[PDB]
Amino acid sequence: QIVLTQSPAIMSASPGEKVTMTCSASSSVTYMYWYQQKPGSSPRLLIYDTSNLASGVPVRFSGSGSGTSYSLTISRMEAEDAATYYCQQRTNYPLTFGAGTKLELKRADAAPTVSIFPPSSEQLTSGGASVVCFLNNFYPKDINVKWKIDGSERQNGVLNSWTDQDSKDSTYSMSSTLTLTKDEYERHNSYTCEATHKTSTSPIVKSFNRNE
Amino acid sequence: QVQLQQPGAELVRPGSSVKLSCKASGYTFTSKWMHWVKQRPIQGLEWIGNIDPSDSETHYNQKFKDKATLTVDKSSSTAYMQLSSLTSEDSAVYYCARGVTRGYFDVWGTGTTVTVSSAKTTAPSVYPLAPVCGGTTGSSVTLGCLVKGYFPEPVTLTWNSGSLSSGVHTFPALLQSGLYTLSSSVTVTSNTWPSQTITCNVAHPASSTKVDKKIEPR
């Protein structure tokens, strides 16, 4: 019945430095358990009964704490450690997990690359028109999209999907797609997708015209 | 050694029931506790219950009664979980888990993704995405392949039958009223396109579809 809060929610650390992750319990707890989950894979046990390490766990992970405050410490951050980490408790059945500390690998500031695509003739045949705007290779994850039709902003019918952090260059990529009807698409001419990133206040602008 | 195999995905309409299994090997099944965990997109891990086959002990999470009924089979070697109710709330990844006594887990199963939806199995579409009329800025050209309106997951998207893989960003699908929408981008130099052939290939096992779409210049 105990509620476990893991802090912070999103971690950003560079390879080769000390990493301290913390979990906090509502009331007194006797033993703590930690779990690692890499993207697209089953979770695994790292630490048990607070201190001790599971078999197969590399010598860099450490755990400590008591009562309400507990910590998982990584002495030296490695590339294969970028994963989500979860809190785990007993002696109160349930038997609950934490929110999940997402350990995300640090990268030097990256600027997004934008490519806007007009709706295909195959979709315009069916009666639908989806304008796809690709936002590729940027750091960090947080970014804002703004669809502008003839200058006026559009909010409904927008689809936004992000990718997980890349294993090679450690950058994020997202796909922005606005869905419209054949009637709604042909009424207007200019279509713009704007990217508002932390790297620059000036929006990265890619646009096209329908009549052309 | 210790392996907990469980089926890929189950797709069942609201109201009806599902029987999940977990083929356990690498250890003595009747010795260690078997636990079950539910994981949702952005809500975290939720523990359901656990069975000891010994000594038959069946624990449950109070929030999961009586949505889940846990049974075991020793032959044969399997640990069962029946979900009775089935609602849109139930749509999640369900994990098998081994543990030595209450209440922590050593090894986790492959995980079965359960999708509770009234939607029917449907074939994909596949559309070619070509750059603006004229030329692309710089030296690197960007191409795309849009797959709209398909159920269920997944779809295998490969460029040039498997000859093109470098600089490819495949974006995860999103639910849009019963049918999924997936997109993928590829970045190559201007000396390769449109001098050489580039084709996006999509296959859907649930509908037996094989689409090869060539990106023609506008």
Residue numbers in the entry:
A (entry chain L): 1 to 212
B (entry chain H): 1 to 218
Question: What do the paper's sentences say?
Answer:
These Fab structures were fitted into the cryoEM maps of the corresponding VLP-Fab complexes. All four MAbs examined here bind to the end of the trimeric spikes that includes the putative receptor attachment region, although only the CHK-9 Fab footprint actually overlaps the site. In summary our structural studies suggest that the CHK-9, m10, and m242 Fab fragments neutralize CHIKV infectivity by blocking the cellular binding site on the A domain of E2 and that the CHK152 inhibits fusion by stabilizing domain B of E2, preventing exposure of the fusion loop on E1.
The E1 glycoprotein participates in cell fusion, whereas the E2 glycoprotein binds to cellular receptors and initiates clathrin-dependent endocytosis. Most neutralizing antibodies bind to E2, as this glycoprotein is more exposed on the viral surface than E1. We also describe pseudo-atomic resolution structures of CHIK VLPs complexed with Fab fragments from four different neutralizing mouse monoclonal antibodies (MAb CHK-9, CHK-152, m10 and m242).
